[PDB]
Specification:
Chains B, F, G, H, I, J, K, L, M, N, O, P: Protein that is stored in high quantity in the viral capsid and may play a role during ejection. The structure is cut from a larger assembly and holds 4 copies of chain A and 12 copies of chain B. By secondary structure, chain A is α+β, with helices and mostly antiparallel strands. Helix content of chain A is about 20%, strand content about 15%. Chain A has 4 helices and 7 strands. Chain A has a 7-stranded mixed β-sheet, with no helix packed on it. The longest helix of chain A has 19 residues, at about 25-45. Chain B is an all-alpha fold. Chain B has one helix spanning about 5-25. Classes of the chains: A alpha+beta, B mainly alpha. Chains H and I meet through helix 1 of H and helix 1 of I.
Chain lengths: ~220, ~30, ~220, ~220, ~220, ~30, ~30, ~30, ~30, ~30, ~30, ~30, ~30, ~30, ~30, ~30
């Protein structure tokens, strides 16, 4: 399914059909993305399971060489980092940074706090690592000075904000999809009926709540206007 | 009103705790 | 049974007979496919059971020879990949790629994460491997150069979206079927009364829900209009 | 009993007597057949029990010699396959393809996934194997070339759809039964009071449910019309 | 008791006195026979008990020698079979075929799947076997060629249909009974108050159910007509 | 309304599991 | 209304499962 | 209103686990 | 109103935890 | 209305099964 | 209305079954 | 109406059976 | 109406039998 | 009406008994 | 009305006893 | 009306003690 097929099933179930309604598709895009990450953390974090190829989104990155702090020599070897910030992964899938081909190359996405002590073992001095720093960028570090010649990597994981990873999505064979709603929503079909139900239940109560309708410099909500 | 993000995670956590107790009774018996 | 038996047995149960109704059949085709993969995952994923043949679909594929990254020489070996994007299979059946004959050939469908390290054991060097990349195309990889001559395979699995696999289905002896409502719905007959009950309960609530019928540039849903 | 005694008991329990009613026998033939496979799976899949003779149906089959794929020589050996599609068998009973005499013949109905590696023992090289391929036809295979002279077999099993298996039924002694409702309905009499009760409970809800009777370009189901 | 006592106690408990009623005594003959075998399989199938002599019916059969498949010579030995179809027995009693005396002769009724391999032990080559084929007829087979001279057997078992088996029932010393309603109903008298209660509860709800009384080219059941 | 052919067999199957469990505790003991 | 031949046969059956659950506990003890 | 296609199997599956737990107590006792 | 995609998956997960605790009692007895 | 000749005989029966379940626990102990 | 001759003898008999269940737990132990 | 001479003697006697059950479990243990 | 000199006695007696049942399960251990 | 000087001292006595019944299972086990 | 200063200190007291009964079961086992 | 700061941390603490009870029954056994 797409984004458009998922929003318009919450809107038709909540019967939000008029232009002049209090709730938008922009309300539902917020809630379908927050209740996607709510729901995957509920299922896939107690005991380990098979996560399907539906929950993953591959995003394309452009790497630049950045220094450690500033331009000084006595600091440390320079890193690579993305041109743009990276959406935050969840800790439930198999994150995988791959060089534009999934089945090839070992670039190892590890945590931000492992990577400050990594690469000291003499057989792991060719392995490129990744992590998302508190800057929000994906920084790379390797003891092999050939790692600075990367120009483009792709990142396949279960990201928290599915809205964020759908802006950085890879270009297709045809071309990059201009509209967001024509992109694919990343959740399995086995989880669409609770994802719709939790978003429909979230807004249906607030759908019939009274509004402060009279413009009279006064709160008309205790009178249920 | 209506909102179901706290009753859902409480009922999930209940079935987790009924699962961790049930799976801790999985014994592979010895002395045969 | 077909789609037309299942679509209308919800509509005749919701009594949605009029052409001037809020819930078209396309609301039901979406909900039947999402509540199918919901229902196959409750029964067939918890512990391992027998799967009936009724949940499976065969889709026919056209494979084309693609390189790993681009036309460079030192990237790696080239793959075959299907021409169109394939549906994502649920992990509960026996997903089976077969060379237009189910009882013949060993084209082994495996995961995307396993296929990057494969074929090194010297007796597994004539076996073709399948997995689904994060593109959405079924990629083919083997260490035998004879595998690049495949022009067509098929693919029997339990797919998540039944609509995506009904549009890519195998042509019959009479021919291809144009109308999607003439194709066979893939769920077992022992699961249709749990399937019809949920999709009716999904919509029987909103079927009596009030709408903003009045054009007055105002949200009238709290007024129960 | 026939179908007619079971169709016209569900109607007479719902008092759907008039020709100008919403729910016709075409609604009830669907619900009696779909709830039969629901009810037989719920009773005879928990543990293995004795299945009565009533749940089974014998169908008659015409076989034709078909190739493996096409007219190439190096594709494999040929099979026998039925002309028309066979109904999907439930996995609860004793499926039994027999050469028109039930008390004779060794034609072995097996799974589709077992049949691709079969007959490799030096003693089981003359046994005819049946399985329902994803084409929907019953395929036949042996290492004995004598099996290609089979012109006719039968198939007595518990099929999922009893309406498909009543249409392909074996010819009687008197003659063919032209009406579907004059054929016998295949379920044991100890399961008919829970079979009728589930169908009447399914339709009595929608039987008093309002309709959109006004031809006024508007959905009046929120108004309970 | 007969059928006439049992049909009318359901009718008097529901007070269906008038000839212009919706629920004829043929609705009750359907519901008594189906709730007889429902109530019989509830009591006597879980753990084996003593079955009374009330649940059995002795039906008379005339046999004819039929070929195996056709008049081809090398197909196999012939069988005997009844002229008409034999009712399906249940698997809870002592089904017993006897040559018109109950205390004489061993004509062993066995299941249809056992009789395809039977009579191979050299001491069991004078014993006649019985099973009901999927044709609907009762088939006879023994390695002793004297079995082809049977003219008439009788069959005593717990059949699923008390009505279908009462019509092939044995002739009395007085004579045949013309009407079905003067034959004995085959259930133990300790099961008749539960048998009547289930049929009365099945029909008491639909007794006071609304009908489409008006002829107006419209379904008037939503209006509770 | 009225129909009691499923609430019978669900109450009857509830009573099989009581007595099948009750006969599962029956022991003709030994060792005097 | 009234028809009480199945609530009788189920109450008699539930107390028949209680009598077996009591007489499966009865022991004529040894090692005195 | 009414539909018993899921209320049937949720009650039928509950009686399966009672029968599954009844037979899991069954022993053929040794040391006579 | 109506939505039953959560009570279905919570009653099935309740009855899946009941089966997994029932099959955690199955023992094949040794030393006879 | 009212007639309690059957509700008497079940409570009198069930109180017997509580009485049998009490006196199936009675032991005269040993080993002193 | 009211009558307390069947309810009293059952409530008094229910307290007898708990007393015999209480005096079946009275033990004077050994091995000191 | 009101009377409390059987409501006293039955709920006193219930706590009697509850007290004798608690003092039947009291042990002065051995083997230190 | 209202008077609570018996309910004060009967709840204090229940909290005595609960407390005397709790201190009955108190042991001082006797292994190294 | 209201006065909470007995329901306080019946509940703070009730939770005292569940507190001692908690600490009466606490042991410092041996044989390592 | 409303006051939650004793309904808090009792419900917090109850959850302590559910924890203190749970941490009285924790073991680091021996004999392997 | 609405406040969910006390009911959340009371219900979370109740589901905590079920988790602490479930992890105390987990055992990795020995003696094969």
């Amino acid at each position: 399914m797409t984004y458009n097929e998922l929003i318009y099933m919450v809107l038709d179930e909540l019967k939000l059909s008029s232009d002049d309604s209090y709730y938008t598709p922009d309300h539902v895009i917020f809630l379908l993305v927050k209740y996607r990450s709510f729901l995957l953390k509920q299922r896939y974090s107690d005991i380990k399971k098979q996560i399907p190829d539906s929950d993953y989104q591959s995003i394309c990155l452009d790497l630049i060489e950045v220094p450690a702090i500033s331009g000084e020599p006595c600091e440390g070897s320079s890193y690579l980092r993305s041109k743009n910030k990276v959406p935050t992964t969840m800790m439930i899938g198999n994150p995988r940074v791959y060089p534009m081909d999934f089945y090839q190359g070992e670039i190892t996405y590890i945590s931000r706090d492992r990577m400050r002590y990594v690469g000291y073992n003499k057989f792991l001095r060719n392995i490129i690592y990744c992590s998302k720093a508190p800057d929000g960028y994906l920084y790379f570090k390797s003891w092999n000075p050939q790692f600075l010649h990367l120009e483009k990597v792709s990142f396949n994981a279960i990201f928290e904000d599915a809205k964020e990873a759908s802006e950085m999505a890879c270009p297709e064979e045809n071309g990059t999809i201009c509209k967001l709603e024509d992109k694919e929503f990343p959740i399995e079909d086995a989880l669409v009926p609770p994802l719709i139900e939790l978003v429909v239940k979230e807004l249906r109560g607030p759908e019939y709540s009274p509004k402060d309708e009279d413009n009279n410099a006064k709160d008309d909500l205790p009178d249920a206007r | 009103f209506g909102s179901g993000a706290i009753g859902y995670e409480f009922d999930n956590r209940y079935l987790n705790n009924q699962e961790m107790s049930a799976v801790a009774k999985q014994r592979l018996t010895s002395l045969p």
